Amino acid sequence: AVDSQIASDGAISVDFLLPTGIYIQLEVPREATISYIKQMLWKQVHNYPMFNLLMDIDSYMFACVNQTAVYEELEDETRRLCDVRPFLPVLKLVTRSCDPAEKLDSKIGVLIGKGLHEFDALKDPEVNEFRRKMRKFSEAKIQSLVGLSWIDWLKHTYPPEHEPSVLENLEDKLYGGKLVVAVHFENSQDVFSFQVSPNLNPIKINELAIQKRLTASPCDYVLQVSGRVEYVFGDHPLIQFQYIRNCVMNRTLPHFILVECCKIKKMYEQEMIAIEAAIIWDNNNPFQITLVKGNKLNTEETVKVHVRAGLFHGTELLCKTVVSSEISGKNDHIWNEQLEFDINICDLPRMARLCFAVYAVVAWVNTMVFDFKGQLRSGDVILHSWSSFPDELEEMLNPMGTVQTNPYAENATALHITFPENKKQPCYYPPFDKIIEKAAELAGKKFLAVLKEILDRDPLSQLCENEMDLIWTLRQDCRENFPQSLPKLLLSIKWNKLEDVAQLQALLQIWPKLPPREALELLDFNYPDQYVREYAVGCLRQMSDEELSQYLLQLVQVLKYEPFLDCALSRFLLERALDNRRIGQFLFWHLRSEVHTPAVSVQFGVILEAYCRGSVGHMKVLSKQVEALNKLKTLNSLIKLNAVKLSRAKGKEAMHTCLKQSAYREALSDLQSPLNPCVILSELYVEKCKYMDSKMKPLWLVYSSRAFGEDSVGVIFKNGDDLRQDMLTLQMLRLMDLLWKEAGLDLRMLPYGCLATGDRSGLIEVVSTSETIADIQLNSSNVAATAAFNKDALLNWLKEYNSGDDLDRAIEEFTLSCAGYCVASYVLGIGDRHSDNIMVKKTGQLFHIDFGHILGNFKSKFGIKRERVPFILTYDFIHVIQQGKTGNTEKFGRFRQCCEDAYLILRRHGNLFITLFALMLTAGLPELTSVKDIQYLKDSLALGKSEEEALKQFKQKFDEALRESWTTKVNWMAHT
Amino acid sequence: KVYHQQYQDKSREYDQLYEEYTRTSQELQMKRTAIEAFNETIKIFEEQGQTQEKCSKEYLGNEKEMQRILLNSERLKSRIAEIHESRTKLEQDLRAQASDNREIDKRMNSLKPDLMQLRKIRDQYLVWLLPHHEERTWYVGKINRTQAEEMLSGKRDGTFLIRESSQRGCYACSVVVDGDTKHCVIYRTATGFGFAEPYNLYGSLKELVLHYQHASLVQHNDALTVTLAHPVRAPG
Ligand SMILES: CS(=O)(=O)N1CCN(Cc2cc3nc(-c4cccc5[nH]ncc45)nc(N4CCOCC4)c3s2)CC1
């Protein structure tokens, strides 16, 4: 009833607002083409006065208000009325040539899901101060793009991936030095094969490509990966390019298409056509805050009144939990009091966070002492509180929570407050330079042993006072031997006084840069300083886009933490996303996925448009997808409805006809995968598309990659479920695969693609030739269907698809993938895994699938609880590893070796895991609620105990699972 | 004066509040979305009022068009009417749902300190910071299947009387399955004892027995069904 999308068939009464104010109501069919309606209205235009001040149809286009308050100018006259669901039936006929570059501002608001006026409607300075700041920079990139010649543009739009020395671990999975690469020309039907040195530059393939007698420069051509907007070029060795590296790594044939410069020039020119559419310190006195009234009607039996205060700098408090005057906790809410803050106004951190709450035994507002330009927040300010939003644990007053206030005024809490405005000349933060001068004016081989025992304990482990003292005492010594210790040191000194702060800031400038993996810690709650953060990102800024894309999820979640807007991180992420290899897309997608939620709506919203703006070109492709996804949401909504009155097989047909229709085959076809920005989507293999048995009936889309792409692509669209736990646990898995390969361990893992695109919406990527172990087991002749329905089903399965030589690799790939998963599961504490959620590819590769819960036991939202996930092994894995072969000590020993080796590798980068899971607290996952949650890892990884004291523990755990090998095998599918 | 009796039933009262609140807050932003959209639609109809009045002043025949325009201004007047009412009824339903959520923070935040008070009692609750057990009951030293089948025949369909194998320095396990007696080889290895290579991590031939009275024999052989409920020396 809030929108027209429910079971209804016929015509609709729409309002047509003409340029001459001529109002006309007409009954128009619901699923009518917007051009058909434009034509329809035009018929009756004359039976209404003023019929002559109008121009022809083709000089005018409709405009509307979306289901999201956005004014949608509908240029594409081919869209169905319902396919562009206007909130109210009304359509304002406007002139097609409405060129004010507010047609751009339409296009943007539409993409994002927030109308740009909303930022003006806030009227608050910073939003406007920064929208305008970014717009300057966004438009500088658009300008950077204009000069650029062919190929140089590609380096700015889709830059090739480089990976030096990764081969110095694993060598030559090629017959001799020679690499086998495949190339064919643009619309050519004949391919050519080449035997090539992996150390050559891509140009040699072009030189080889031209060696085809049929009668241009090799430089006038470019190598595009066949079926992807992925390109390979540059004065670099073939093996160095991530593409090649992968084909080499998975013994796959690199597929290249040769594009003539004029075809990339063409794309550049069509994109540049759209680009043209761009038309005091010395205040030695104490600090105190005065406030007036509140606004609660709430009543309590055991306790009457409620009122609190207090101030922090991250986790560290700078004052005691200040209380307030008791009023009427059942009736009267109005009052006044001068709030005592036993802290000097001079010795105050510019990143100080003034927090407030009430006696919970109930709401909260936390607002910063300083503002966007470091001006002392003074004068009368209103604080819109977060009622029933406090978390179970907070240390009386919550310091973690947002500084950005509640969007609701009516029937949502508020607070009145005043700060010392007094003087006509205000007080601003001490300069970025003046604090170094403050430090310059102010001006261990034995210890090497002690501090190594201090500056080691995991990021979540908080030091005790005496340790803090020595860390600061021997601060210069550790700077020289333990540079990686600054995270510990930065927490040693109390931020209460400026003298230490100055010396601390001095250290940072003269402190070396820690690696990006390390730097990441300096972006959590612990470190809120505007200069440590400026250096933290400093290090990130010196990281690859491929390395960047890795920690991107949680980097976005740090934007959620950020108290301001023009921060170095936002500036960095946008700076990076505007030069994307595929970065920009995820940056963009991850942002919409949360813009729907109040607290981030302004945050992400602004950042989003700032991207859209610097992405005037690509903009089309992102929209192509947004439309593609909406069409899916609806088809799914209809699929849910169908499933009731429709047979499993009749609802399939229903789905198939729906896809085959004009609206679908256009929208959700031939426009780029949101999961992989490089992967092209092209024609759907409709006949093979399906919907799953599940409670949300998710679609299973198959994309026959037509002529050029070797095989088919397969997506899963799932609306109704939180696809973020998977999105994070799959990313965690991608890391383990990273780390093991790093150390030297290709356990042939499959962390398949996953992206949550919005609220309970998103995509899972399909892995080709795969199968659920339950599926493999049933529907098989179980030892002539006589005994144990389970044994060797999984083996014969592999035997079926692997011939002689192939069977060895199959079982080899099975082993380490199983090993890799066995460790990674336990370590990440992935629970309630059954033969319904473990899978096997036809390559022998094993992998996991339903990530409902991590770092504790799975219990539904109503009664969410925790439990240790033991290491588990099924008889079914051993049996395959074994081959059934009664006695050995080389294969089920190779397994245990890997299992041990892997578990040990993870231990080493245990801090990397705890840091990422710590930055993922802001994201708001039902699991990740507190640091008590990340504490699971410390245990799983045996982080205190030494390598061999901890190996022994796991060596036991592994054997104990071999004891429960059939016992667990039973739990996998007996009742299940 | 009350101490530890229960907890679990009052614990789940939080979700009885939170499951409906999360749905209600979600509906409130959804209901506010429409008022923004509604209030934005009006803006377009309002602009029409201005344009129809400005475009009408264009009289550059004038008598019949005086009322035809007037009628249409007065119908356009009547549209913005029903759409101001339509917006107001939704604005009334926001006020309702929002009022209900305030009477829920009156219930939610009142039961939250119940666990905070529990902390002093809850975290202080501290105290801490088989007939196979006999060797001879199943062991039968140096024997032959012939002499093993002998004893076991007549006994219950799940008895254990373990011999010593024909094979040099090995062992065997003679067992009465649901039907009759079956004999499998148990092995010695540095890893321990057990019927098959990856599954032979048993320090003693007894701790094995003790870990196979619980677990089935089926894994090593489909033929070998039943575990070990009775060794030798039954009551009565
Ligand atoms: C014919 S039918 O589809 O109607 N029917 C229902 C389910 N089917 C088995 C499967 C279930 C399944 N669920 C998931 C999933 C479920 C929920 C959350 C998830 N996150 N990631 C995967 C996933 N992910 C899957 N893929 C597999 C390979 O690429 C990868 C995923 C598969 S394959 C067969 C019988």
Domains and CATH numbers, chain A: 1-280 (3.10.20.770), 281-420 (2.60.40.150), 421-615 (1.25.40.70), 616-768 (3.30.1010.10), 769-974 (1.10.1070.11)
**Which among B124, B149, B179 is the end of a domain?**
B124
Which residue in A444, A546, A527, A382 sits closest to A919, CA to CA? A527
Which residue in A554, A580, A617, A605 sits closest to A268, CA to CA? A617
Centroid of ligand 1 to alpha carbon of A708 (angstroms): 28
**Which among B81, B107, B124 is the end of a domain?**
B124
Instruction: Using an 8 Å CB-CB cutoff, list chain A residues near B52.
Output: 20-23
Q: Is A772's C-beta closer than 6 angstroms to any atom of ligand 1?
A: yes
Q: A223, A256 in Cβ contact below 8 A? A: yes
Instruction: Using an 8 Å CB-CB cutoff, list chain A residues near B186.
Output: none
Q: A684, A669 in Cβ contact below 8 A? A: yes
Angle at A907 between CA A904 and CA A912, to 5 degrees: 140
Shortest distance, CA A90 to any CA of chain B (angstroms): 8
Angle of helix A619-645 versus helix A648-660 axis, rounded to 10: 150
d(CA A257, CA A708): 8
Q: A515, A539 in Cβ contact below 8 A? A: yes
d(CA A88, CA A102): 22
Based on the fold, state whether residues B19 and B120 are members of the same structural domain: yes
Q: Is A599's C-beta closer than 6 angstroms to any atom of ligand 1?
A: no
Decide: helix, strand or coil at residue A116. coil
Q: Is A767's C-beta closer than 6 angstroms to any atom of ligand 1?
A: yes
Based on the fold, state whether residues B175 and B117 are members of the same structural domain: no
Identity at B167, one-letter amino acid code: Q
Residue range of the domain that includes B203 = 131-236
Is A388 close to B45, i.e. CB distance below 8 A?
no
**For chain B, what is the domain count?**
2
Provide the token pair at A635.
Answer: 């088809």
User: In units of Å, what resolution does this entry have?
Assistant: 3.3
Q: A888, A882 in Cβ contact below 8 A? A: yes
Cross-strand pairs, B162:
B139
**DSSP strand pairing (A255-260 vs A763-765):** unpaired
Is A69 close to B40, i.e. CB distance below 8 A?
yes
Centroid of ligand 1 to alpha carbon of A836 (angstroms): 9
Based on the fold, state whether residues B222 and B189 are members of the same structural domain: yes
d(CA A118, CA A608): 14
Q: Where are the strands (E) in A620-745, listed by range?
A: 690-691, 699-703, 713-717
The 8-class DSSP code of residue B80 comes to H
Q: Is A770's C-beta closer than 6 angstroms to any atom of ligand 1?
A: yes
Closest CB from A49, A298, A886 relative to B197:
A886
- CA dihedral (A154, A155, A161, A165) in degrees, to 10, reads 150
Instruction: Using an 8 Å CB-CB cutoff, list chain B residues near A392.
Output: 112, 115
Comparing alpha-carbon positions, the chain B residue that sits nearest to A69 is B37
Decide: helix, strand or coil at residue A354. strand
d(CA A267, CA A673): 19
d(CA A532, CA A542): 16
d(CA B151, CA B131): 19
Which residue in A794, A957, A786, A801 sits closest to A876, CA to CA? A794
Chain length of chain B:
236
User: Please, after which residues is chain A broken with C–N above 2.5 Å?
Assistant: 215, 279, 361, 443
Instruction: Using an 8 Å CB-CB cutoff, list chain A residues near B101.
Output: 411
Comparing alpha-carbon positions, the chain A residue that sits nearest to B67 is A49
Provide the token pair at A332.
Answer: 């009267």
Whichever domain contains B55, its CATH number is 1.10.287.1490
Q: A430, A402 in Cβ contact below 8 A? A: no
Based on the fold, state whether residues B217 and B137 are members of the same structural domain: yes
d(CA A261, CA A264): 5
Centroid of ligand 1 to alpha carbon of A723 (angstroms): 13
Query: DSSP alpha helices (H): ranges in A698-804?
Result: 724-743, 773-777, 793-801
Closest CB from A411, A881, A886 relative to B196:
A886
Provide the token pair at A606.
Answer: 């602004």
Which residue in A628, A853, A656 sits closest to A763, CA to CA? A628
Burial class (CB in 10 A: 0-12, 13-18, 19+), A12: middle
Is A967 close to B115, i.e. CB distance below 8 A?
no
Whichever domain contains B180, its CATH number is 3.30.505.10
Nearest CA, atom 10, ligand 1 = A772
Q: B184, B172 in Cβ contact below 8 A? A: yes
Based on the fold, state whether residues B83 and B138 are members of the same structural domain: no
Closest CB from A49, A862, A881 relative to B68:
A49
Q: Is A9's C-beta closer than 6 angstroms to any atom of ligand 1?
A: no
Based on the fold, state whether residues B114 and B152 are members of the same structural domain: no
Based on the fold, state whether residues B62 and B169 are members of the same structural domain: no
Based on the fold, state whether residues B4 and B102 are members of the same structural domain: yes
Is A966 close to B218, i.e. CB distance below 8 A?
yes
Based on the fold, state whether residues B146 and B111 are members of the same structural domain: no
Decide: helix, strand or coil at residue B48. helix
Q: Where are the strands (E) in B164-206, listed by range?
A: 171-176, 181-189, 192-194
What's the first-to-final CA gap in chain A, in angstroms?
A: 40
Based on the fold, state whether residues B162 and B236 are members of the same structural domain: yes
Q: A546, A583 in Cβ contact below 8 A? A: no
Torsion angles phi and psi, residue A257, rounded to 5: -115, 140
Burial class (CB in 10 A: 0-12, 13-18, 19+), A314: buried
The conformational region for residue A379 under phi > 0 = left, psi -120 to 50 = alpha, else beta, is left
d(CA A334, CA A872): 60
Query: DSSP alpha helices (H): ranges in A541-618?
Result: 545-561, 568-577, 583-595, 598-614
What technique determined this structure? X-ray
d(CA B6, CA B28): 36
Closest CB from B21, B113, B218 relative to A360:
B113
Shortest distance, CA B167 to any CA of chain A (angstroms): 16
Closest CB from B29, B45, B69 relative to A17:
B45
Is A963 close to B211, i.e. CB distance below 8 A?
yes
Comparing alpha-carbon positions, the chain B residue that sits nearest to A596 is B29
Q: Is A693's C-beta closer than 6 angstroms to any atom of ligand 1?
A: yes
d(CA A544, CA A162): 9
Nearest CA, atom 22, ligand 1 = A849
Angle of helix A125-147 versus helix A568-577 axis, rounded to 10: 30
Identity at A203, one-letter amino acid code: I
Which residue in A879, A894, A876, A892 sits closest to A839, CA to CA? A876
Based on the fold, state whether residues B156 and B81 are members of the same structural domain: no
Centroid of ligand 1 to alpha carbon of B29 (angstroms): 33
Instruction: Using an 8 Å CB-CB cutoff, list chain A residues near B48.
Output: 17, 21, 23, 92
Candidates A3, A13, A23, A87, partner chain B, best to mutate (most B CBs within 10 A):
A23
Edge-to-edge strands of the sheet including A379-382?
A337-344, A286-291, A416-419, A379-382
Identity at A819, one-letter amino acid code: A
What is the full DSSP assignment across A53-64? Answer: S---GGGEEEEE
Q: Ligand 1: which atom is nearest the Cα of residue A771?
A: 33
A803 contacts: CB under 8 Å, gap ≥ 6: none
Based on the fold, state whether residues B119 and B141 are members of the same structural domain: no
Which residue in A495, A487, A491, A488 sits closest to A515, CA to CA? A487
The 8-class DSSP code of residue A883 comes to T
d(CA A704, CA A325): 71
Q: Is A871's C-beta closer than 6 angstroms to any atom of ligand 1?
A: no
- CA dihedral (A883, A886, A890, A894) in degrees, to 10, reads 60
Is B51 close to A20, i.e. CB distance below 8 A?
yes
Is A388 close to B104, i.e. CB distance below 8 A?
yes
Q: Is A752's C-beta closer than 6 angstroms to any atom of ligand 1?
A: yes
**Which among B124, B139, B158 is the end of a domain?**
B124
Identity at A363, one-letter amino acid code: A
A906 contacts: CB under 8 Å, gap ≥ 6: A736, A739, A823, A824, A827, A913, A941
